[PDB]
């Protein structure tokens, strides 16, 4: 049941930076009410980097217990150490997640072969669906198509999150893999086109603030209605952009706080949306009707 | 104490991937023997990404206890999470390291201000010398010259390991900082030019296999003997190149095992030097006199 608009959920912290379960619950009800298809908990937008292993499973567990099978809950469990990816992945599983999102090793720059062995091992170590995650703009390494196809043959690897924002690349992963290997967008601005070429969804930041509009956009795209897709899309386009004027999730939390859904909390090394960027993001929210 | 030829020491693993203390000992004796200026334990080349915290202190502690205070011992303690960086930094201090090496946040892409707050916190939080590390080609982010000058004014942030290999950049940092803030090289091939420009050292990978040559190179370079430095350097040049035929530390470990100094053990997601790179690196080692 994993596809369409999948919010890359933020982890709300109170002013002190401590986890805030009340806000966590409203964001889930928010997405349970407005049509979100899946919730990705504790991934990049959820500030995976600055969470104890302890806070990490507890966020997975409360989203899973709150969702009650009504929607898939995918947990971020990638790490740049294969052993740790196994452990975090094992933790998500016996935690309730329906699948795990695993970013490619970042800082150590593995060879293409090392990336295959890395993911094949996790896939073989833990009985739980696993989605790959390619984002060279952060990891400083790129999983090439040939490596994806190799991985696409592995039993538990159900799909990939392509974030380069490159359509030529996406098309290329789609031509090389089976119909049963799902390709997701990791780029909010061009997700619509990825879906028209065969993609099966969007793991988005934009869905944080416009869930309903993003599931409408995905359904259209994934149903062939290229005209509705690009129309919702160009209407959302300034939010897409504004949501990135500073590294994510610095902006999305600002918005989320402005709609009264989360406290002003973020953990170092992240900062709060710096003052000079407030009004552009504010303008984009008003035009887009997410803020009045 | 801290400058000159500073080997970015590898952490030896046996064939099953367990720490090898005897082999760590020889590497320490080797460097104490062949004149290495300082030892950086558990940094990037020491495969920090794949070491429990248990192993992290076990290694720092063992190098320190063997060094017996004759040479400085810098431990890697950076993390993309400010709290984890303090943690690792504290373990290092209360472990005997003389200084700590801290790479910038690698996947969350913090603002320049965020990088300042982050490093400022670590420096106030733990009474121990701290060196910044900037290597955008891994971290997907770049600390700007203005952020280095600001951090250079913090009490115990003693220097920076600039790895871009961009000399315009090195000059700028040198020109901006006080002369009690030291700039070290993070790019073996251009370290000579960095020191000739005002730099104070090379946290070297090539030093793993040629401690003596790199020590002499650094001495000339840091004296002002440009002609001697560059001569040692174009001589070493094919080793510099070969040692990166695949993401470091993959090549350097191969070299070290061919030399009889460490086992054939590397941790996933890394792989052992792929078959097609063996002879080019063997050739470079023989050309430089490291292997007969």
UniProtKB/Swiss-Prot annotation, chains A, B:
Recorded metabolic or biological pathway in which this protein acts: Amino-acid biosynthesis; L-lysine biosynthesis via DAP pathway; (S)-tetrahydrodipicolinate from L-aspartate: step 3/4
GO cellular component: cytosol
Amino-acid positions noted as binding pyruvate in the UniProt annotation, renumbered to this chain: 45, 203
Top class in the EC scheme: lyase
Pfam families: DHDPS
List of catalytic residues: 133, 161
Entry note: thermal dependence: Optimum temperature is 37 degrees Celsius. The activity decreases slowly when temperatures are reduced from 37 degrees Celsius while the drop in activity is relatively more rapid when temperatures are raised above 37 degrees Celsius. In this case, the activity reduces to almost 30% at 52 degrees Celsius.
Gene Ontology terms describing biological process: diaminopimelate biosynthetic process; lysine biosynthetic process via diaminopimelate
Site residues by UniProt (Part of a proton relay during catalysis): 44, 107
Major localization class: cytoplasm
InterPro entries recorded: Aldolase_TIM, DapA, DapA-like, Schiff_base-form_aldolases_AS, Schiff_base-form_aldolases_CS
UniProt-listed CDD domains: DHDPS (cd00950)
Compartment(s) where it occurs, according to its Swiss-Prot or TrEMBL record: Cytoplasm
E.C. number(s) listed in UniProt: 4.3.3.7
Keywords: Amino-acid biosynthesis, Cytoplasm, Diaminopimelate biosynthesis, Lyase, Lysine biosynthesis, Schiff base
Disulfide bonds: none
Catalysed conversion reaction: L-aspartate 4-semialdehyde + pyruvate = (2S,4S)-4-hydroxy-2,3,4,5-tetrahydrodipicolinate + H2O + H(+)
GO molecular function: 4-hydroxy-tetrahydrodipicolinate synthase activity
Comment on pH dependence: Optimum pH is 8.0. At pH 9.0 or above, only 30% activity is observed.
Assembly mode: Homodimer.
Classification via PANTHER family: 4-HYDROXY-2-OXOGLUTARATE ALDOLASE, MITOCHONDRIAL (PTHR12128:SF66), DIHYDRODIPICOLINATE SYNTHASE (PTHR12128)
Similarity comment text for this entry: Belongs to the DapA family.
Protein name: 4-hydroxy-tetrahydrodipicolinate synthase
Underlying gene: dapA
């Amino acid at each position: 049941m994993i596809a369409g608009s999948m919010v890359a959920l933020v982890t709300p912290f109170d002013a002190q930076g401590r986890l805030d379960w009340d806000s966590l619950a409203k964001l889930v009800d928010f997405h349970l009410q407005d049509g979100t298809n899946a919730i990705v908990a504790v991934g990049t937008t959820g500030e995976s980097a600055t969470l104890d292993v302890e806070e990490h499973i507890q966020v997975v567990r409360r989203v899973v217990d709150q969702v009650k099978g009504r929607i898939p809950v995918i947990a971020g469990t990638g790490a740049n150490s294969t052993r740790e990816a196994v452990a975090l992945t094992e933790a998500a599983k016996s935690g309730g997640a329906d699948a795990c999102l695993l970013v490619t090793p970042y800082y150590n720059k593995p060879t293409q072969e090392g990336m295959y062995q890395h993911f094949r091992h996790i896939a073989e170590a833990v009985a739980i669906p696993q989605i790959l995650y390619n984002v060279p703009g952060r990891t400083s390494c790129d999983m090439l198509p040939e490596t994806v196809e190799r991985l696409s043959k592995v039993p538990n690897i159900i799909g990939i999150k392509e974030a380069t924002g490159d359509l030529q690349r996406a098309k290329e992963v789609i031509e090389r893999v089976g119909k049963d290997f799902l390709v997701y967008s990791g780029d909010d601005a061009t997700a619509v086109e990825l879906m028209l070429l065969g993609g099966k969804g969007n793991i988005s930041v934009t869905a944080n603030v416009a869930p309903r509009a993003m599931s409408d956009l995905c359904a259209a795209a994934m149903r062939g209605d290229a005209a509705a897709a690009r129309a919702i899309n160009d209407r959302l386009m300034p939010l897409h952009k504004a949501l990135f004027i500073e590294s994510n999730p610095i902006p999305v939390k600002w918005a989320l706080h402005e709609m009264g859904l989360i406290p002003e909390g973020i953990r170092l090394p992240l900062t709060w949306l710096s003052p000079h960027c407030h009004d552009p993001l504010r303008q984009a929210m008003r035009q887009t009707g997410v803020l009045a």
